[PDB]
Amino acid sequence: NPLFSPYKMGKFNLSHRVVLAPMTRCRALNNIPQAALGEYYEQRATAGGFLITEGTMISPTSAGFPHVPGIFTKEQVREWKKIVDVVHAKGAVIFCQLWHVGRASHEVYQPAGAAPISSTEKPISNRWRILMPDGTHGIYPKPRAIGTYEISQVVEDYRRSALNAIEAGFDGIEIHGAHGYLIDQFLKDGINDRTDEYGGSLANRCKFITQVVQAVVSAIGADRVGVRVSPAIDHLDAMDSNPLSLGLAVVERLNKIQLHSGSKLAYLHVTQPRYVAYGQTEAGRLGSEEEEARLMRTLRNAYQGTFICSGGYTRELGIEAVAQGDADLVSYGRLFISNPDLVMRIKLNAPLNKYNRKTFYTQDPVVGYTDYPFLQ
Amino acid sequence: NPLFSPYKMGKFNLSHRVVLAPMTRCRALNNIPQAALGEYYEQRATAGGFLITEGTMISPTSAGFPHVPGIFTKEQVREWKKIVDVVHAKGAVIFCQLWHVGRASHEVYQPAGAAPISSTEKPISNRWRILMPDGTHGIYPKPRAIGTYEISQVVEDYRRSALNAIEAGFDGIEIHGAHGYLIDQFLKDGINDRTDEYGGSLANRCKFITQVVQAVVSAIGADRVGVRVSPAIDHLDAMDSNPLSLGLAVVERLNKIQLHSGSKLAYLHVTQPRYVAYGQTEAGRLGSEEEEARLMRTLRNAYQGTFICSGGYTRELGIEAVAQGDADLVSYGRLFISNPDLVMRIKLNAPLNKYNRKTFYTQDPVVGYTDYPFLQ
Ligand SMILES: Cc1cc2nc3c(=O)[nH]c(=O)nc-3n(C[C@H](O)[C@H](O)[C@H](O)COP(=O)(O)O)c2cc1C
Numbered sequence: 001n002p003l004f005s006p007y008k009m010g011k012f013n014l015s016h017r018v019v020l021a022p023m024t025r026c027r028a029l030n031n032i033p034q035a036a037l038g039e040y041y042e043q044r045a046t047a048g049g050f051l052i053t054e055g056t057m058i059s060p061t062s063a064g065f066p067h068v069p070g071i072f073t074k075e076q077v078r079e080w081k082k083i084v085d086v087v088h089a090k091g092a093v094i095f096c097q098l099w100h101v102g103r104a105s106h107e108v109y110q111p112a113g114a115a116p117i118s119s120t121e122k123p124i125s126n127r128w129r130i131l132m133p134d135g136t137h138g139i140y141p142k143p144r145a146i147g148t149y150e151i152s153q154v155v156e157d158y159r160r161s162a163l164n165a166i167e168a169g170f171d172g173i174e175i176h177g178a179h180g181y182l183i184d185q186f187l188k189d190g191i192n193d194r195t196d197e198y199g200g201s202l203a204n205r206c207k208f209i210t211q212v213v214q215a216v217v218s219a220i221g222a223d224r225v226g227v228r229v230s231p232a233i234d235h236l237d238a239m240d241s242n243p244l245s246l247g248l249a250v251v252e253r254l255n256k257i258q259l260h261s262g263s264k265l266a267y268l269h270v271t272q273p274r275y276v277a278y279g280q281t282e283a284g285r286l287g288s289e290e291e292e293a294r295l296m297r298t299l300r301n302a303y304q305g306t307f308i309c310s311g312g313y314t315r316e317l318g319i320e321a322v323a324q325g326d327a328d329l330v331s332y333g334r335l336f337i338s339n340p341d342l343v344m345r346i347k348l349n350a351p352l353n354k355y356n357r358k359t360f361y362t363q364d365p366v367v368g369y370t371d372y373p374f375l376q
Numbered sequence: 377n378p379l380f381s382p383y384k385m386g387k388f389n390l391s392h393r394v395v396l397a398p399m400t401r402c403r404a405l406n407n408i409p410q411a412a413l414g415e416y417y418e419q420r421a422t423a424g425g426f427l428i429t430e431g432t433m434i435s436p437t438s439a440g441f442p443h444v445p446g447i448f449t450k451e452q453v454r455e456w457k458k459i460v461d462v463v464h465a466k467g468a469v470i471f472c473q474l475w476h477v478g479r480a481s482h483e484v485y486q487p488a489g490a491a492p493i494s495s496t497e498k499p500i501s502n503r504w505r506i507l508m509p510d511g512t513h514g515i516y517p518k519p520r521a522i523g524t525y526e527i528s529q530v531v532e533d534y535r536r537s538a539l540n541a542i543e544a545g546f547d548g549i550e551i552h553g554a555h556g557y558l559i560d561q562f563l564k565d566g567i568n569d570r571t572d573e574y575g576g577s578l579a580n581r582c583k584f585i586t587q588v589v590q591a592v593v594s595a596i597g598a599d600r601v602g603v604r605v606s607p608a609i610d611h612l613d614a615m616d617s618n619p620l621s622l623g624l625a626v627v628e629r630l631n632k633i634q635l636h637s638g639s640k641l642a643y644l645h646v647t648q649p650r651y652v653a654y655g656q657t658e659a660g661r662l663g664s665e666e667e668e669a670r671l672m673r674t675l676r677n678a679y680q681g682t683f684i685c686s687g688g689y690t691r692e693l694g695i696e697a698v699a700q701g702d703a704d705l706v707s708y709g710r711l712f713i714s715n716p717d718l719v720m721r722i723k724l725n726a727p728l729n730k731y732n733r734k735t736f737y738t739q740d741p742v743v744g745y746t747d748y749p750f751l752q
């Protein structure tokens with residue numbers, strides 16, 4: 001099983017290639033990591049396995065979900081330390097994902113009910129909904145477009161949060177630059193309508209992610225920084241006119257940061273669009289994933305370092321990805337929600353528990369969070 | 377059991393609400409209905425049960441699957457009559473679905489080597505494939521956007537095929553106006569990029585289906601016409617910027633044909649979207665199930681007549697649909713493939729056979745077609 005051949009990610013000797021994808025679960029009540037998160041990550045940790053946390057706030061303006069953890073206060077750092085310690089005691093490696101949602105927020109999540117910040121004043125359209133604190137769905141509002149100085153302050157929020165993660169004992173951080181959140185609002189030409197030095201050309205659109213990555217690399221070292229992007233996913237109205245060109249331009253910049261810094265990043269992590277093959281249509285099961293596969297393989301080929309693929313992977317697709325050389329590591333989201341022992345189940349080719357979307361984002365510390373059963 | 381409360385569909389006294397959905401199965405060798413189809417439909421026919429045939433060709437250029445029946449030649453009419461007779465001997469009602477695939481074709485199904493016809497010049501994208509005669513998957517070619525003047529000839533093909541279906545003894549026809557095929561290529565503004573009178577406004581985009589339905593109603597009467605649409609489906613790149621406005625525009629023109637005709641159509645048949653896109657994203661699924669139930673209920677409330685729902689129904693969901701007033705009739709596809717006596721099994725709550733997708737579209741007159749077992 002190629003998913004269980006060891007992989008050397010920088011200094012880390014991983015025993016297998018099954019990664020816990022970062023997943024927002026909303027159990028970090030009032031943005032404080034809770035004991036429940038310790039139980040959850042400990043259930044899923046394995047010796048030599050790599051875990052990535054849920055998206056974690058870098059500042060008071062960075063959230064667009066309820067009860068997501070922060071790492072911008074010392075109180076948050078102290079609670080994160082307890083979670084990191086129980087994961088390390090199982091021999092796992094864990095990175096903290098640093099997440100700013102940008103325009104994907106709501107007055108209810110902002111200090112003093114201020115407008116969310118973005119590259120643009122354009123709102124996400126009513127194709128999309130936000131989860132409100134009472135469990136209902138709300139409408140994204142108009143964001144405020146930030147200028148150059150405020151951009152530098154957001155970059156410093158990333159830097160300070162990266163330092164805090166290291167203080168908490170994390171092995172590194174992952175920059176959430178995907179899925180139409182703040183960084184992707186600068187990258188995507190369907191969102192970034194700026195005319196200043198952060199808008200227009202590919203170079204300009206890539207400036208913000210380059211500045212964020214450079215700031216955290218200069219603070220904690222390139223080896224402790226992973227980067228996540230999704231050029232071909234248009235979640236939250238995040239389309240680009242040319243996704244492969246945008247992805248290659250980002251890869252370009254990461255390779256250049258690595259040459260200048262003299263060190264490789266921990267990894268590039270890319271989520272791919274994944275089209276469900278509807279079984280009830282005439283041709284839904286005749287589909288081909290070749291074009292999207294070629295896009296992913298071209299990003300991997302272009303990037304000088306470790307590549308993590310994500311988005312709809314199964315045991316079989318993960319095995320194929322590693323066997324074909326298409327990725328070094330494979331991250332799993334939904335199946336890891338419902339299978340605390342996903343690594344072992346994939347090793348044994350055991351049945352996998354179904355997942356219940358209804359409890360993905362509820363607040364109970366057990367129900368739908370830590371009560372999915374282990375192999376019996 | 378609400379699914380076994382009788383239903384009056386026009387002059388048809390149906391004894392239960394379980395409908396055989398139209399399903400392409402590719403047993404109609406060289407486009408001529410075969411004795412195997414007779415056995416297959418006879419197996420599934422019940423006293424007072426409603427059956428809809430597989431999509432059936434309206435012209436030599438209208439197919440996109442191998443060995444699908446036509447009803448545009450008198451030979452085809454003669455073979456269909458034999459099938460209709462065995463279904464009627466069982467006391468069932470049967471409608472012939474008239475099917476033109478538009479741009480979802482291939483040169484192998486184009487006898488004069490012409491490009492497939494459509495509203496648009498844009499081909500179906502690379503992630504969709506066509507079933508080839510040898511079982512492999514082929515690539516969809518570039519279609520030709522038909523001129524304004526050619527539309528009336530395709531409408532005429534529907535009219536002549538509807539007359540032929542009646543000559544064969546069918547109780548009615550169903551217009552396949554769904555799933556990204558020819559009529560849906562005019563409906564969906566994600567496909568229809570015309571600038572003439574059949575493009576642009578919802579009114580313009582609805583003209584083609586209105587003219588098709590009017591032609592067949594004027595040929596055989598409204599009571600013998602059902603109409604199938606899918607305003608929200610992911611199939612062959614058929615998307616729309618406002619499915620509800622599109623669906624309501626279609627319903628309002630159907631209601632108007634009924635008002636001016638002085639008779640109601642046999643029914644409106646709507647595919648349930650079963651939206652599962654963006655499951656791998658943070659927010660992609662928020663409020664989508666609610667939007668989907670809103671869409672279907674808004675259409676059924678607006679349509680003045682019988683409403684058939686289809687797509688992903690089980691025994692339980694079919695009961696709930698009829699119980700809540702969401703549908704008058706529920707059509708089943710995949711479970712009817714593998715359970716010839718699905719009606720009886722649903723009545724008794726018996727175990728349901730699994731289906732084998734590998735033999736959905738093969739040519740064997742028995743294997744995977746009529747050799748699924750009845751209750752013992
Ligand atoms: C409930 C849920 C929460 C998620 N939260 C995050 C997140 O906080 N940060 C992120 O980068 N991706 C997030 N994702 C995307 C996942 O990291 C991952 O890319 C996706 O789940 C992989 O597809 P799979 O579920 O088929 O394995 C989330 C996905 C789900 C379903």
Ligand SMILES: Cc1cc2nc3c(=O)[nH]c(=O)nc-3n(C[C@H](O)[C@H](O)[C@H](O)COP(=O)(O)O)c2cc1C
Pocket residue numbers: 279280281282397398399400401430431473475552554604647686687688689707708709710711736
């Ligand atoms: C093998 C197969 C062939 C189908 N052929 C047609 C068709 O020719 N015309 C049509 O309108 N729908 C067709 N459909 C869609 C079905 O009519 C129906 O909507 C679907 O099967 C219902 O969902 P279910 O299988 O979960 O019951 C087909 C579906 C399948 C699985």
